[PDB]
């Protein structure tokens, strides 16, 4: 855990796609989330009760990490990707959002650069992914299929 | 998000089944759960620390939304529906719980009316769904299958 947490950040999209579990494992487990799960009492805890302001700040940090995690999982579920780090969809690429070939982006761009190129199309793409899944379920409820 | 949140409430069960992502998206995202995830500090936060009672009420609301969400997801997992908004099971309908044909309920009833008709059979049905999944796993652990 955290042995190369953002190690692929400067690498290409292709190479970086091979380290996806590395970042996923660090979204729900900060130091305080490890101390909170010791078999022994952590001892510190009395401090956070005697002084309730510190107790509240710690809980807010823990609750937020959980809420952010769950929201990303909910979107993957809605889009039809329950689990999987990499999933294919039926939404075609518009070639307006970005107009580059596969041999250019997977080999020459980093994920940070990509993110800064299509950031204002994010909501359009997410909207289409949701519509696609709804259409798929409508087709599933037809026993003659395709 | 929230552009027709309960819009299908007065519609029939059939039509309403086509809007399921609309309600699902609003279970983990109230206004305070959006403000809490800004890149900038929300600014308000000092108020909830200076006066710890308000800080606690806000956390209780956030924790509860998460617990309710997770409990529903756990039941779907137990019943054998990981993900999916609509899933088929192997539990037969009893015709005691409700005794109507498909052409009557999917076209003439709303979900609110349905809920008020079979509410005291809810636990029986949930119990059967769990038993069904356990039986399925017992059959899966047999390499000769069916």
């Amino acid at each position: 855990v955290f042995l190369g947490f953002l190690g692929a950040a400067g690498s290409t999209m292709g190479a970086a796609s091979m380290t996806l579990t590395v970042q996923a494992r660090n979204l729900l487990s900060g130091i305080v989330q490890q101390q909170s799960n010791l078999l022994r009492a952590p001892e510190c805890q009395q401090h956070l009760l005697k002084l309730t302001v510190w107790g509240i700040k710690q809980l807010q940090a823990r609750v937020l990490a959980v809420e952010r995690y769950l929201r990303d999982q909910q979107l993957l579920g809605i889009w039809g990707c329950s689990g999987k780090l990499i999933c294919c969809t039926n939404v075609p690429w518009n070639s307006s959002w970005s107009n580059r070939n596969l041999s250019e982006i997977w080999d020459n761009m980093t994920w940070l650069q990509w993110d800064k190129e299509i950031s204002n199309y994010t909501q359009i793409i997410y909207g289409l992914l949701e519509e696609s899944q709804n259409q798929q379920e409508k087709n599933e409820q037809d026993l003659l299929a395709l | 998000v929230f552009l027709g949140f309960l819009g299908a409430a007065g519609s029939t069960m059939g039509a309403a089944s086509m809007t399921l992502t609309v309600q699902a998206r609003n279970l983990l995202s109230g206004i305070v759960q959006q403000q809490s995830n800004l890149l900038r500090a929300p600014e308000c936060q000092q108020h909830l620390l200076k006066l710890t009672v308000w800080g606690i009420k806000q956390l209780q609301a956030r924790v509860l939304a998460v617990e309710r969400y997770l409990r529903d997801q756990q039941l779907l997992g137990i019943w054998g529906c990981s993900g999916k908004l609509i899933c088929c099971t192997n539990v037969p309908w009893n015709s005691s719980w409700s005794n109507r044909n498909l052409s009557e309920i999917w076209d003439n009833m709303t979900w609110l009316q349905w809920d008020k008709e079979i509410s005291n059979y809810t636990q029986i049905i949930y119990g059967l769904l769990e038993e069904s999944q356990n039986q399925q796993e017992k059959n899966e652990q047999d390499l000769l299958a069916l």
Partner: antibody
Amino acid sequence: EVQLVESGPGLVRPSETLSLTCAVSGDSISTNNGWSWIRQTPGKGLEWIGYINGRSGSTRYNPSLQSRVTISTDTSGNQFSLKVNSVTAADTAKYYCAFFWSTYYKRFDVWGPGVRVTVS
Amino acid sequence: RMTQSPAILSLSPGERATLSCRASQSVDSRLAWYQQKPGQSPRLLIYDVSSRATGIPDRFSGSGSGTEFTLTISSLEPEDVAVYFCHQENDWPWTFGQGTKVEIK
């Protein structure tokens, strides 16, 4: 509610292609997937030929005719048709136009009267 | 992939008629029955083994699972002379049984 009306040659010769059509009244064939052809052959009974999905144009054909039958639509005429290549005496049968609705909520069929086709 | 039996039944009016159908492979619960009167195209009677189609008399019923199925007509009437067909709905080939006849004397 729809009505299905078949029409076509009542006689086809060996190695000729048989072409039958079906008009649809009361609803659209550009949608309502499940437009199909069924064959009733004396001495064999009923079998499927195949069907078409009006919304996408895709088709499925019973494997026995996988290399012999084409099903397509005329959505302007709101009619659909069946063509079977290399027709032989063994293909003499009563042919039917049918609409099969099978979903999670409803099940029903509509059948036309059909066309009897003699094959020499 | 399904066989009906017997080829023909002959019954007195009001008598109960039963027809069997056996699959070579499981068809789950996906079985439909049809009634074809001479000069007519087949009418759907029963679907999903025991569900009645809209407009079907309560004389008609059925049961079965997997590979073993039965069509039953109680209180058989003269208007029920027809060829009855067994239809597979659990696989792509959708085969039909050969059809059996029930005649009222």
